[PDB]
């Protein structure tokens, strides 16, 4: 009487999808080739950033799925009041909220969703790599490499397997899928702002700068940002072109001078030497933007959510929030259609792809305002 679903990928979107479907009564199995990130034996946590901005929409998605869990899962998130813009003179200006965001730790959020899933009948299958799918009019046969071949049949499959989705490739054999991948001329580097030694009453913690603002140092086609952690430290991120970064890291002094010149007010709050070290040593992940149409295999046999459907630019886009909204939209469509996945998945493709156009255009406009159109003397250095 129950239907079974294989969800491929146990990142943030996959875990939320698993929560949503298990709650709605489906028999869920959640696969990931990675080891369980809650284990100390698992060395690669695959965490692209230490923390995340979760929007009202992202929060509302988790809340629509499980309000009690959502309360518990998000208890330590730090609400933001606005953005704090830092100019070349180290002047800060508060711009109060667009959409509200809250800072939350990535590891904690992903680990907490897994914890919630263990309280359901969801089967967790780490160490399982999806390698092939056979599509039929009844069940879909999913082939895995474990550790070792392994196959299991499912009524339908949800690809939440990220930007390079194996599920998406498998779908492409069954349906004509328009597809594009674009490798961004953009890299990011994670930096660190330590907690202060003493509790700062006006900040409510050991914070070196305002914890209730997303801090941005916007420059011409590059940017530094910072978002608070619960312990008083900030996760800081530098974004710049591949060419700019490659040219900088040829020399430690060159990086150091660049940082001092462009972000002079970070010397008060960050160790320059290890910043330089982090800058030269941080592994540079390639950022790819991918788009998809359709998102489903006809007859309700499969659907793609999260980065697997629409991997987008960091910061300027909001991949996790978008993926959380994917899930919320899908579940509402399933309820609207009384469990008819054929109808729901088809309508999903139509409406979500209209949404994606609007989302993409917003992100481009965000990049234009915040990073491209930056030439004033307060933001672009004159030698």
List, as residue ranges, the binding site.
13, 32-34, 53, 83, 97, 106, 130, 188, 307, 318-321, 366
302 binds ligand FAD (CB under 6 A): no
Which residues contribute to the annotated binding site for FAD?
13, 32-34, 53, 106, 130, 188, 307, 318-321
b/e for 167-184, b at 16 or more Cβ within 10 A?
bbbbbeebeebeeeeeee
Q: Nearer Cβ to ligand FAD, position 307 or 347? A: 307
5, 6, 7, 13: residue in contact with ligand FAD (rule CB under 6 A): 13
53 binds ligand FAD (CB under 6 A): yes
Residue 270 CA, distance from chain mean position: 25
Which residues contribute to the annotated binding site for L-kynurenine?
83, 97, 366
How many chain residues are in contact with ligand FAD, going by CB under 6 A? 32
21, 26, 33, 207: residue in contact with ligand FAD (rule CB under 6 A): 33
Tell me how far apart the alpha carbons of residues 254 and 271 are, in angstroms, rounded to a whole number.
16
- What the block records as the tokens of 55 is 């929007």
Q: How many CB atoms lie within 10 A of CB 11?
A: 24
7, 32, 187, 189: residue in contact with ligand FAD (rule CB under 6 A): 32
34 binds ligand FAD (CB under 6 A): yes
314 binds ligand FAD (CB under 6 A): yes
Residues between 124 and 143 that touch ligand FAD (CB under 6 A):
129-130
Contact 218, 370 (CB under 8 A): yes
Distances (CA, A) of 129 to 8, 144, 165, 290, 306: 9, 5, 11, 21, 18
30, 74, 166, 186: residue in contact with ligand FAD (rule CB under 6 A): 166
4, 27, 35, 49: residue in contact with ligand FAD (rule CB under 6 A): 49
Residues 6+ apart with CB under 8 A from 187: 239, 240, 241, 242, 245, 284, 285, 286, 287
Residues between 174 and 193 that touch ligand FAD (CB under 6 A):
188
Tell me how far apart the alpha carbons of residues 90 and 356 are, in angstroms, rounded to a whole number.
37
52 binds ligand FAD (CB under 6 A): yes
318, 346, 349, 371: residue in contact with ligand FAD (rule CB under 6 A): 318
Is the backbone peptide bond immediately before 294 cis, with ω within 30 degrees of 0? yes
Tell me how far apart the alpha carbons of residues 61 and 53 are, in angstroms, rounded to a whole number.
14
User: Minimum CB separation from ligand FAD for residue 18, in Å?
Assistant: 11
User: Minimum CB separation from ligand FAD for residue 162, in Å?
Assistant: 3
- What the block records as the tokens of 216 is 């941005």
Span of 22-30, 68-76, 84-92, 159-167 interacting with ligand FAD by CB under 6 A: 159-167
Q: How many CB atoms lie within 10 A of CB 193?
A: 24
Residues found near ligand FAD in the complex (CB under 6 A): 8-14, 31-34, 46, 48-49, 52-53, 129-130, 160-162, 166, 188, 306-308, 314, 318-321, 323
């Amino acid at each position: 009487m129950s239907e079974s679903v294989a969800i491929i990928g146990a990142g943030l979107v996959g875990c939320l999808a698993a929560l949503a479907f298990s709650k709605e009564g489906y028999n869920v199995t959640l696969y990931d080739f990675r080891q369980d990130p809650r284990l100390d034996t698992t060395k690669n946590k695959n965490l692209k950033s230490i923390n995340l901005a979760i929007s009202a929409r992202g929060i509302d998605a988790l809340k629509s799925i499980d309000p009690d869990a959502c309360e518990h899962i998000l208890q330590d998130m730090i609400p933001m009041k606005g953005r704090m813009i830092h100019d070349l003179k180290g002047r800060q200006e508060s711009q109060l909220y667009g959409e509200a965001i809250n800072s939350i730790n990535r590891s904690v959020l992903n680990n907490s969703l897994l914890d919630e899933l263990e309280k359901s009948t969801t089967e967790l299958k780490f160490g399982h790599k999806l390698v092939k799918i056979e599509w039929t009019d009844d069940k879909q046969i999913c082939h895995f490499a474990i550790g070792t071949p392994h196959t299991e049949k499912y009524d339908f499959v949800i690809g939440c397997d990220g930007a390079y989705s194996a599920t998406r490739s498998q779908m492409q054999r069954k349906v004509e899928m328009d597809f594009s991948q674009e490798y961004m001329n953009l890299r990011y580097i994670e930096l660190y702002i330590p907690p202060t030694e003493e509790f700062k009453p006006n900040y409510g913690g050991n914070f070196a700068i305002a914890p209730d603002h997303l801090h941005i140092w916007p420059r011409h086609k590059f940017m530094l940002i910072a978002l608070a952690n619960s312990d008083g430290s900030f996760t800081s991120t530098f974004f710049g072109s591949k060419d700019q970064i490659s040219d900088l890291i040829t020399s430690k002094s060159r990086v150091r001078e660049f940082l001092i010149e462009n972000f002079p007010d970070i010397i008060n709050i960050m160790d320059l030497d290890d910043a330089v070290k982090r800058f030269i040593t941080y592994p540079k992940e390639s950022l790819v933007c991918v788009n998809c149409k359709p998102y489903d295999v006809p007859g309700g046999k499969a659907i793609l959510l999260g980065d697997a459907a629409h991997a987008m630019v960091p910061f300027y886009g909001q991949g996790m929030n978008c993926g959380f909204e994917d899930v919320r939209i899908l579940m509402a469509l399933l309820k609207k259609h009384s469990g008819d996945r054929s109808r729901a998945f088809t309508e999903y493709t139509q409406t979500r792809h209209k949404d994606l156009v609007s989302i993409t255009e917003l992100a481009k406009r965000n990049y234009k305002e915040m990073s491209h159109d930056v030439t004033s003397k307060r933001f672009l250095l004159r030698k």
